[PDB]
Design a binder for this molecule. Sequence first.
Ligand SMILES: [Mg+2]
Ligand SMILES: [Zn+2]
Lengths: 759, 199, 187, 123, 77, 227, 119, 62
Amino acid sequence: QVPVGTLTSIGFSISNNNDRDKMSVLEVEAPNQVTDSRLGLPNPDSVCRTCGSKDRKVCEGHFGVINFAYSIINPYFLKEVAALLNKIGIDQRLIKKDIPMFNSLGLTSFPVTPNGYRERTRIYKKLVGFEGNTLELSSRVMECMQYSRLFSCGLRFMKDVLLGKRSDHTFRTVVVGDPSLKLNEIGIPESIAKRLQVSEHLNQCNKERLVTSIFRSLMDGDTVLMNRPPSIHQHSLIAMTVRILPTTSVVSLNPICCLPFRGDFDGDCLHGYVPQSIQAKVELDELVALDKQLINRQNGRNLLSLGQDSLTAAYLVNVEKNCYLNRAQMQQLQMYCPFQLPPPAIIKASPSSTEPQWTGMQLFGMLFPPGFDYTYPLNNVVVSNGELLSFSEGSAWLRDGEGNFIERLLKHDKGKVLDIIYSAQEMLSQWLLMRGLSVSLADLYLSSDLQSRKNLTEEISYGLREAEQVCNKQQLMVESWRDFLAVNGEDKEEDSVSDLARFCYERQKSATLSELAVSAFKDAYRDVQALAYRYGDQSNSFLIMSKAGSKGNIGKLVQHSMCIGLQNSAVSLSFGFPRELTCAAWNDPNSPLRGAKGKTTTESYVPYGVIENSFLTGLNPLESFVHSVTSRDSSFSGNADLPGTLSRRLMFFMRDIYAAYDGTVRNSFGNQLVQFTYETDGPVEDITGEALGSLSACALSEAAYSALDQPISLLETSPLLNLKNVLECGSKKGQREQTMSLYLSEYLSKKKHGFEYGS
Amino acid sequence: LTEEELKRLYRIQKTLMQMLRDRGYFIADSELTMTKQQFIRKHGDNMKREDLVTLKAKRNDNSDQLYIFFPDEAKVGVKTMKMYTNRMKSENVFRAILVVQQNLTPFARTCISEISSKFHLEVFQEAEMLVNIKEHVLVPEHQVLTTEEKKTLLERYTVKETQLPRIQVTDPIARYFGLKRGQVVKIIRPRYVTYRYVV
Amino acid sequence: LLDSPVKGDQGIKKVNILWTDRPKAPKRNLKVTMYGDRGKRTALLETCLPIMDMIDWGRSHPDNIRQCCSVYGIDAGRSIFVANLESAVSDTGKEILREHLLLVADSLSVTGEFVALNAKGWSKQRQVESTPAPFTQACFSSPSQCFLKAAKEGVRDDLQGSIDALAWGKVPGFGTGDQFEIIISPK
Amino acid sequence: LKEPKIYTHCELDLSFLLGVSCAVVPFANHDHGRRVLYQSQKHCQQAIGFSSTNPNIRCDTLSQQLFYPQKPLFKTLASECLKKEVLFNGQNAIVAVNVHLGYNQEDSIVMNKASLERGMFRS
Amino acid sequence: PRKTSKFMTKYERARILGTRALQISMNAPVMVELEGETDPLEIAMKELRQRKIPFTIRRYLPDGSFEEWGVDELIVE
Amino acid sequence: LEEQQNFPFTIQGIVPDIVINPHAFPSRQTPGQLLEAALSKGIACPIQKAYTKLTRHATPFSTPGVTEITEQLHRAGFSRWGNERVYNGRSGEMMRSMIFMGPTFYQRLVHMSEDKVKFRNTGPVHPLTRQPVADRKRFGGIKFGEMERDCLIAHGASANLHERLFTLSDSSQMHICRKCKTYANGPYCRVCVSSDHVVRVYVPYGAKLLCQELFSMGITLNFDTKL
Amino acid sequence: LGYMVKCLLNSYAGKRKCENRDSFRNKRIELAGELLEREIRVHLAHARRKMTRAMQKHLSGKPIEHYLDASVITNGLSRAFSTGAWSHPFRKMERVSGVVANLGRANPLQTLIDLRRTR
Amino acid sequence: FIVRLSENEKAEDYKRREKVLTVYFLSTEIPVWLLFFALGVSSDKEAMDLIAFDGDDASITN
Ligand SMILES: [Mg+2]
Ligand SMILES: [Zn+2]
């Protein structure tokens, strides 16, 4: 028996000769049985002599010394005499003995493995008079000090034993979609809930309820943790309320709630942690649960925005404007919303119509409470007294933007936002079921019956021949062409306008003018991508999901309908794609695929080609090869470790910075001051006691895990490598290339064209 | 080309007075605000040596003065800089600034080891201060606090002398004002405050 | 003779004329200026200055942070690191606040110089601040040369960090533990 | 080949440039470059279907087999000259693109209860 | 004196509620006699609402000193 | 799994047995599935009237155009683009937009539901580190990793992180003398006078194995305890 | 050799391009006809090293079936097929582990593409 | 048979370090021109027709 206490300071020291023999003197001189039962469990059915000897519960290990008559110097102290030598009594005992501090500096005793982690058991059976030389007795313990687990085992021992520990009372299942539940609600089936035990102490009311069934089952009212591997940001650890329902061994939750999880329903699993103590149960629904972390502090705005179906339905309700539903299908949709019905805005729209029909934009007023004031100038929508009144060609006030109605509802009352987004989904789904969203073949055709596809083809074939002459003009901005751009008559001007294959061949090799031949095509293709609004009706199912910003954009429609565009990769070798890629362009000397040229160092190429065939007409076997060369960079998977090793070394640089009670930040090691005042934009001093650096390191981890890793060819490297090169400040790899800056701020601006003459 | 050398020496004499004005050492208008032709038309242009030793004291006091040394020959050793060390001990001053053309010698660096306790003697090259460092936009203005103001600051924020953010002595701003180990400096931001303790 | 320079300097590789709308180090009292981008291959700014006798020196500064700090102070180093991070994170895709950008600049410039994002720059930061905590330095690098070299000097570790306190059953300093006490007072 | 009299060689068929798991996929050039690579060596290798016709001599773990396998409606040229109908696994289903009460959100599939009890997709 | 904030933080409330629910789970006499509510989370909430708990917050300054804070003077929204 | 009457039924009698999301089309970028569904529909439906002039090849590099499928599906009673007018299953009214339909070819994969369920209710214990075993056949338990612990650090919960890495993980005791700084095993120190005042602390087994490795490597520990 | 020096000068001058490894004009494969022979060529030397060492001891100072031990190739080829280790094509003291892959029988399409691959 | 065109670090007077022709045959490092006279031609003017390519003489004749 012993009283309880807490440790406060760990002290490291070299184990001296007195430090070994002071404890656990059990069977010191026994060379025949060096794995004796008095110090461990050698046999699988062994017994300790001086213990209770149960199955690895009473005995926590028993050490022992090894008496060696030979005197050997420890290898940790052997490096001191190699540096304590000089050309010069009293000076040989002062500078050489400070950290040992006049000790013996010799290994007389030696500790033994306690036979709990012993490869290592039958090694110390022959060091009772091993040899005569002082080298074979030093190597025999040098191999024993090197075959341990704390020797590079290494970091893999640390991050699997001390940093990451497996825990009980958990569950791991795949998740599916279910929009019938609430926001902070999940679903556990009966086969999992009938086995997971949750402890709770006895009370005076349920004394006849627990004894007729402490260890009870996972009933309703409890809360569990949710987690998706890997943890991207801070809001990926939401604790939601449990609700049992009969399901065939799969969990389910709201598909609009998967936006903090950043995962889809294509097979992703969900980790589940269950608490048992009351101190771990009350803290879950106070700081961790979904009704508390409603503010995404990485961005400073709303966290739970609209999903995929609800965004498209909220778009179509306010943009369609030509559906007049009567009072029969209006009172059915007034049950999912907690507000009453507005008066009918249309009493009689036609002499052949008798019943008062409602308005589509009047149906969207069943979600805003009475007293809601909201105005967005970019979409001209005005919400006056809980009823929106205007709408003109806007979709930015619905998704995660700058100013939207979700953030203005979270700033209004912040008490029933989870009861507003829930009714904005369970009513909009029933409304979209009455209309039906389907992608037919006419949506990929994007054209009329006859001659409208031919006009589109004859316009694409002329817009892809002008974007080539635009890019050909940009290659005349080379300093070797300074005599051509002058106001003077030339004789070799016809050789620079007739050669069309030569200007395509110059774009492949020498990748220093190929960065202005991609950005020129990307600026001449903006007048080509704008053809998807003149062609095709407004009821096309792609233009609905593209203008609302649900899935895709206008770039993912012109490749379906008109043309794929340009294809450029990072770096390739010994082959490049020519212009006019057909069957006839498969000759050796006149194409850069097989032979470079005839005249010539062209071993390395950077390919660039434009395809005029879309995903609907059909790709050529060469156009399906260009699309396999270019899109091969997005197929690798050996790059996910690079946003995993960045945020691991970035973590502890801010993970100890917290907020003290003095109004300033601190440092947990030496009580140092990082800064004197936190840089809060809001005037409310509510950030006190929380680790504001641990939510700032994940704020940079979330901008690195979701980084658009589509690299530019040769000038810019990557949006993640440019972040790492800024974050790596003190990593001085070398002084090979240093760039300066010379600002032209002087008296040259008073004269005419002073900056161009000064530069 | 002696005109380029006279312009390079004019820039040093123009930035030194502007550094001492930011340090506040009672600079008259005869040396400050000098044109590019006034150094030729006023001073002796036929002087091919470093004859720019200027005596100047403080503003609020006249006991401690400052020596702006200009050695003639480069690569100053212990055999040549004896008179550059004897004058400060003969006229009993405690602060002096000397500039160099090339890099220093270790024999001269072993001379300021036991001599910096009484008379502080620091060095910085003239090949780097061709422009003004304090006039840059990226660096804000600083205010070196007095010991009568450093005592009331550590008792208000209840912070010790080692729990503050550190600034090195070899930094070109802490060496610009002639700061030693122990004093703090107030640094403002374009409108918050953040002090820094010199390590 | 075929490698000797005939025009310009000797250590300058190439210069470029760029045009940016929102550059670093603003004018502080118009329009967007155009500046040169000199690229060098001893010192960096102490040898590019006396080579040009056409001095139009305004707010010129080196682009590298390790040179900009060692030239113009750790304040200009922090001010250029914030401006270099607020472009990289904005080009990464998201839109972070300055509250999470200034804290990294104030935490990576504590000892007057910018340190690397590794363990060799973390030990050199934790050994200047007089906080001998060698436990967390062993969980980042290899644990072989972190406990042997620390036991040969006699350091005294303390339960200060979060990982150093959670490993021995205790709670971290911040959060809901070890920052306040719940004790029944007699008054 | 009929119009130009300049050619000296010709290919047998343009569909015979892919592997046996990729040249039987219908409209292999209409798909994305990372969407037929995600199916030619990632979905056909783990798709249940036909199995060994002699389950009395082959004893190995995880030997699954579909009850009613079905050849597809189309007949590609790489599946006609091979004279083999074993490399097509899975059954046919009359699909329909529709927003069905939000239950098929985020790349999910809602199915029929009265179709999995009649023999479809039983294994 | 008292140089700290007047409002109660959530990180202290989440510990005060757990420490109070631990007593009610171990049969503590409720000095608020609220009826209808029986769960130890609802009893501690109604006890913090009536501010009748015998708990005081002894906050720890990072310098080394300390100062107490009673629940009768501490307010919470 | 919806029942048969609740699906949107067609005039002929066909019921859609698999309904996919139309939002996955402009992001996955897979056209030709709506072409496969329009080419398999024109060869399965009967012609009213020519069962020889129809195309049913669907060659990968010799694909038939849209003008050949939209004119072969038109000759049997269906629409050109493949879509058809569907009704409602719950209400019964007509829909304002048609729904595309076609007999595609779907495959079933290996990864089922029962082969991925995994929970832990304090089963077997690993004999080395006293942790739950990572066996899918026996009782399992998911590892509480580094970022999964930093996410609870950032939330400010330090009392939930205390029962996660100590209580639900390996939990052992450790005795230590007060004057002497050497631990042994009840409490019995051979360096000090035995059983005068010995205190015990709460250290997990993952850190107690570190002390056993350091003492077997050659580094002792001298730690003091409060109260 | 004169043509070999001329071909080097024509490639240093920039006329003849250098031969790259990323093509199939300069790359050949081996499918159990030039890959299985290396494991026999290596192990027959191991058998001859044992036969000479057995005949050096029994003659200094007629079991012909004992002097030619057949338990080396039978225990070598099965050991190479089990763990997947092989011999290096260019080096001698190196072992690759990519020649042997376990055949799958989940569907007859997997065993059709597992037989036609290229490393 | 590895014919190498590299600098002559060996058998040099620390000034003449230019591109030379060395052949690596059975680890001998013999010069190529002495292997030319070792067999066959026995003539220096008749040893350039075997290396005849008709190219521009810029730095290969050196
Ligand atoms: Mg997924
Ligand atoms: Zn025992």
